[PDB]
XYZ file of C-alpha atoms in Angstrom:
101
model
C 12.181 16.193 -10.142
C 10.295 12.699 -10.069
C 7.250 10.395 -11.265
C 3.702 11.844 -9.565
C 4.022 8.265 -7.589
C 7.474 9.256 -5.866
C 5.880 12.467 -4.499
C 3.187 10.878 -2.625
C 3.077 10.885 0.477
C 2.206 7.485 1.643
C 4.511 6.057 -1.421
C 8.342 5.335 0.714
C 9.881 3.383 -1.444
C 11.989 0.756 -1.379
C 12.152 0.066 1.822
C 11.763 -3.666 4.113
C 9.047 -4.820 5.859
C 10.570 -4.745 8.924
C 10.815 -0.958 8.566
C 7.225 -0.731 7.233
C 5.936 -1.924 10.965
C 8.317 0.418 12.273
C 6.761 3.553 10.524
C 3.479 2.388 11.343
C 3.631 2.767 15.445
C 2.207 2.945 17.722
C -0.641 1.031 15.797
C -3.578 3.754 14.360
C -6.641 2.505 12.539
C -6.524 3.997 9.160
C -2.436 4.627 9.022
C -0.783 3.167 5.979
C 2.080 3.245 3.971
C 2.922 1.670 0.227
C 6.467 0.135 0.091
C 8.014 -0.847 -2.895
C 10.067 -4.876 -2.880
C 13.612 -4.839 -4.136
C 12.684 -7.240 -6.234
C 12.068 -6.714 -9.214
C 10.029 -3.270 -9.401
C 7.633 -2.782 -8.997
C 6.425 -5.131 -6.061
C 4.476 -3.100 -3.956
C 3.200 -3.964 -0.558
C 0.459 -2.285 1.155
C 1.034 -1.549 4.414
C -1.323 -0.541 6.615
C -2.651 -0.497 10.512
C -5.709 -2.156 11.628
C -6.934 -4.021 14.557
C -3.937 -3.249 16.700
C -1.407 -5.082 14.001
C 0.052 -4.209 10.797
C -1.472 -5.655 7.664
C 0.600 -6.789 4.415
C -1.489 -6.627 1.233
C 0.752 -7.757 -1.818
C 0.674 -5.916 -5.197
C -0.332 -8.692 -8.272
C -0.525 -7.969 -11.791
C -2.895 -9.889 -14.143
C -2.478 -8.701 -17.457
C -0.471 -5.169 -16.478
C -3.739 -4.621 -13.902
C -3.014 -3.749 -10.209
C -5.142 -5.866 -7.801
C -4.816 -6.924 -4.023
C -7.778 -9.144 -3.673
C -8.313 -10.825 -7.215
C -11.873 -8.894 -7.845
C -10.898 -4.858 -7.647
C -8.316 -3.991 -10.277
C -6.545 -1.026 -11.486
C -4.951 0.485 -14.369
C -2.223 2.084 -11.625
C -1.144 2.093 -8.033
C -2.573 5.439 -7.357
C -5.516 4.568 -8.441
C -5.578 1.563 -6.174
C -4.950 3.353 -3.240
C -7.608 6.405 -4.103
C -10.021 3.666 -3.983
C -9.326 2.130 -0.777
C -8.863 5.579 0.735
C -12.646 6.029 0.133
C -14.136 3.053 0.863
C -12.580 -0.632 3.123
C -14.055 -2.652 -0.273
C -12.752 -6.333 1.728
C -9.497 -4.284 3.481
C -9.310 -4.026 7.139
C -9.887 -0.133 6.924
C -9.892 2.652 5.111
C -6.742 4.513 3.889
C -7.673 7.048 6.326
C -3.980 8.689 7.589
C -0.790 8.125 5.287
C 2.881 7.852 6.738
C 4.330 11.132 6.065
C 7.137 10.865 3.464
């Protein structure tokens, strides 16, 4: 049927930013959503709610390894976002509520 990423939830794929702060409204602290850039795959962006505003954190990849803030990295983008999920670690908030998709 599909890769475990495509069934996740909070994974829409390749959708625009403009329809990522769509999705996420009205704003909800802990509501996020990973979109994918039609790059180029994967460029991922994650999206998520905080302070009243919709934050963009950019996917980079040193060396194959997933990171958003140079100092966390991951072997995958799951894994990223289990992380954040648990604990802020430098975001604006948790990963508390994903977009339904």
């Amino acid at each position: 049927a599909g890769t475990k990423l495509s069934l996740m939830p909070w994974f829409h794929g390749k959708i625009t930013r403009e329809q990522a702060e769509r999705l996420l409204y009205p704003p909800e602290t802990g509501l996020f959503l990973v979109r994918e850039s039609t790059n180029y795959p994967g460029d991922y962006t994650l999206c998520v709610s905080c302070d009243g505003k919709v934050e963009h954190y950019r996917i980079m990849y040193h060396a194959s390894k997933l990171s958003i803030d140079e100092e966390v990295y991951f072997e995958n983008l799951m894994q990223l976002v289990e992380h954040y999920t648990s604990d802020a670690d430098g975001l604006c908030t948790r990963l508390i509520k994903p977009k339904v998709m």
